[PDB]
């Protein structure tokens, strides 16, 4: 009745936890069969952000929930089913199953009159059922939407093979003994040109932008728990770049020698990107460097330095858009895309409307949405409250013009925040 | 007529090269139905030391014979199947081939009173040829016969699954889904332990005296390029396990971070074994480190640490025993067990019989063999000499003494050279 979470991955399990901590009722809505969010998805072969290879780049320790921790024989990165099969466990022990809604997707979330939200919803049949809550949060992750490049390259709709996203991505075998390009430097593009790296005939690795690769490791620590030490955080933002560049180049020398075109951004301005394979992929000539692609010829993949491969399959791996369908008016922006939401979680003009998760910053979320989670719960039964609307609209146009200054406009940077100084607010 | 070379690998085509340009007879007999010595036996699925997941761990350029490049489209650290290639295009273009008897396995090799040896051979049919030639170089490789445990652990007698040896190993689909334990920490161990790690359930590694594991590659630079450059070269024995014991602390932490034994000796003392692969494999719980296995139970391995874990196999990686099956009295050695050949390579009592590629250097053999081929070939055809025996055994009784110094006892001692001071003599 209170409250109603849509969506029962890692974040909306820990607010439905600081719900139930306050006594206060509530709902879980879930599109899903179970638990989990995309952490389920490989392994149940649904298409989803996720890969059969795919393990967490964060250490296991910061990315479980504080008073619940994975089992000691897990691994310092575990694999998705892990996490997947921890998260189900966490669900368990905090009694959160009997609030669960599983494969029920809402549909339409509106505000009211009077003051609560109007939620529907649609079941396994198909039915669709109103019900009336009185705040809602929203824990629908921001991973949602495939984004393609703007513009495919000439001659795609002549490709004698199969053009698809990250999101369609599963394994690899399925690409066994083929021939196939990855588009992008982020996560997703290392992860899935490394796994078809030992499966393909031949991958390649198509990039235009260049981004920093960085290893999981340095001095055998998680750059998460380098974050976290003492001495970095003593270190001056300069110190910490200037140290991080003679590591980096102790630890794998430099980009360009490696065939990728250097980043035109120092180490921490921008995304960095985490792997221990890709770089060695390439000295092993298993995977092969590109830039752009500049045409599809057929069966071959034409790039904008002249060159051209037979190629099977293109797999684009550019990214997701944040987008929230259930909400007519959508998320909150200022028009320029950026996100408005007070403390990155509350609207100012949406009374009893919370987003939880929809922050991006360096190393695991966890520790962010349970904070989040907590101060919601107290908001909800009036034990928190909020400033007038224009002094949120302060906090949020602060936040920003920090944003632009440092980040300048760019995709998603309206999100980011370093998890030391937001934590400490909480 | 003049000379028969035994073995047609890389060692044995390196002597028909040298052999052909000095206008010296011979021919050349390898067992094996193609030449490239190990190289090509992954891709046959014959059973050899490799494995399908083998590339170089040593430079492209380096590797390659000096007048005679690979493919500028190879990687730094071609795979298998290229080297073998790479091999049969050498022997192609040197014009080897009409000199080669392939299928044809050299069953033993007399000196008789005159001078000359006699070598029977047996063909494919099976039929047996006597054929006297001037002189004989041996190139038949060391890493031939498998060297399991002395003692197994108690209980294998009885073990309901198969223990084999790296030799029996070939690719690792062979155990999908299945559990298995990896014996040792060599170069194989590494690489098959890394490879059962995307194929298997359950990969452990069975660790009982700990080695320095490198990355391929620091600052960029492959470990082997490193040990060229003048810098390098200019620093003191000291200064430069000083500049690596930082360098891998930076690159990768402590061994012992890793579940693995710290050694007890410092990086240069001893073999070193190089892996981009096998720490992160630990770090993402892909490969488990375990110490010796104490004995068999069934369908379970016990640890000497009173752990247990059931396993379908055992995949034993603790090399190979260097063996000369076709010389009755054997390579000449000090009963130690040391070789005992002049500037490794001639015996000091057996004229007209000489040994190429018996040799263990950091990185890649292949300076060393040209080097070897070329003096052998102007040995052969009376251009350069010989010390008497008594001074040959000087040399040889020196380099012992040097060795024992170094590397003490150990097995395999007695063919380290390092590829700077050695190359330097020719
Ligand atoms: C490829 C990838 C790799 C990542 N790796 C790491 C990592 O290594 N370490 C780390 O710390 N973080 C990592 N993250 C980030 C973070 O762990 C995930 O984004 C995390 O799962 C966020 O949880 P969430 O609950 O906010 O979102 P999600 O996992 O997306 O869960 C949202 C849930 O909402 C449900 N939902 C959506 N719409 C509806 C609807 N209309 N009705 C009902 N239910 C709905 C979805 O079905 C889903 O279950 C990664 C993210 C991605 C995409
Ligand atoms: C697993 C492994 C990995 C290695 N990786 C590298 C690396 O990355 N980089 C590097 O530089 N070096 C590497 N080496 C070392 C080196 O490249 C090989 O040892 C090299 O192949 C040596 O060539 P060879 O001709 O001396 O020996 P081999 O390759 O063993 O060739 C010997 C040949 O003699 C033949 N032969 C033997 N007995 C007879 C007989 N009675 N009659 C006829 N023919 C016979 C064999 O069939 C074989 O073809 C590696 C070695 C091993 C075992």
């Not at 809550?133 to 495939?146: I, K, L, R, W």
């Not at 984004?147 to 199969?162: E, I, V, W, Y």
């Not at 982020?186 to 960085?214: C, K, M, P, Y």
């Not at 990214?319 to 320029?336: E, K, Q």
Request: hydrophobic share 40%; charged share 20%.
């Amino acid at each position: 009745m209170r409250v109603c979470v849509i969506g029962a991955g890692l974040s909306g399990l820990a607010v439905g936890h600081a719900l139930k901590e306050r006594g206060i009722s509530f709902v879980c809505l879930e599109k899903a069969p179970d638990v989990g969010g995309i952490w389920r998805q490989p392994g149940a072969g649904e298409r989803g952000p996720g890969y059969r290879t795919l393990h967490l780049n964060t250490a296991k320790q910061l990315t479980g929930y504080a008073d619940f921790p994975m089992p000691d024989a897990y691994p310092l990165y575990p694999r998705h089913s892990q996490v997947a099969a921890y998260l189900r466990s966490f669900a368990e022990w905090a009694g959160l199953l009997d609030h669960v809604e599983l494969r029920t997707e809402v549909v339409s979330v509106r505000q009211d009159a009077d003051g609560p939200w109007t939620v529907v919803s649609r079941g396994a049949d198909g039915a669709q059922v109103s019900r009336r809550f009185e705040q809602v949060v929203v824990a629908s992750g921001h991973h949602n939407e495939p984004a393609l490049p703007d513009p495919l390259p000439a001659g795609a709709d002549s490709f004698a093979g199969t053009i698809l996203h990250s999101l369609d991505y599963r394994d690899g075998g399925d690409f066994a003994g083929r021939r196939v390009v990855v588009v992008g430097l982020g996560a997703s593009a290392v992860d899935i040109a490394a796994d078809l790296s030992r499966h393909a005939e031949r991958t390649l690795l198509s990039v235009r932008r260049g981004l920093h690769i960085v290893p999981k490791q340095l001095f055998g620590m998680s750059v998460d728990e380098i974050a976290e030490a003492p001495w970095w955080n003593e270190m001056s933002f300069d110190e910490r770049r200037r140290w991080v560049e003679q590591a980096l180049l102790v630890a794998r020398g430099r980009l360009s020698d490696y065939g990728l075109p250097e980043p035109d951004h120092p180490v921490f301005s921008s995304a960095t990107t985490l792997s221990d394979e890709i770089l060695s992929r390439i000295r092993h000539g298993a995977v092969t460097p590109k830039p752009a692609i500049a045409s599809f010829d057929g069966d071959r993949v034409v790039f904008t330095d002249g060159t051209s491969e037979p190629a099977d399959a293109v797999v684009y791996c550019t990214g997701f858009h944040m987008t929230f369908p259930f909400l007519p008016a959508g998320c909150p922006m200022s028009a320029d895309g950026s996100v408005e939401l007070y403390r990155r979680v509350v609207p100012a003009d949406r009374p009893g409307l919370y987003f939880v998760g929809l922050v991006r910053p360096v190393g695991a979320i966890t520790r962010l949405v349970e904070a989040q989670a907590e101060w919601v719960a107290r908001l909800v039964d009036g034990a928190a409250v909020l400033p007038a609307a224009d002094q949120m609209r302060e906090e949020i146009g602060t936040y920003l013009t920090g944003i632009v200054q440092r980040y300048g406009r760019t995709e998603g940077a309206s999100i980011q925040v370093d998890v030391g100084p937001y934590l400490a607010e909480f």
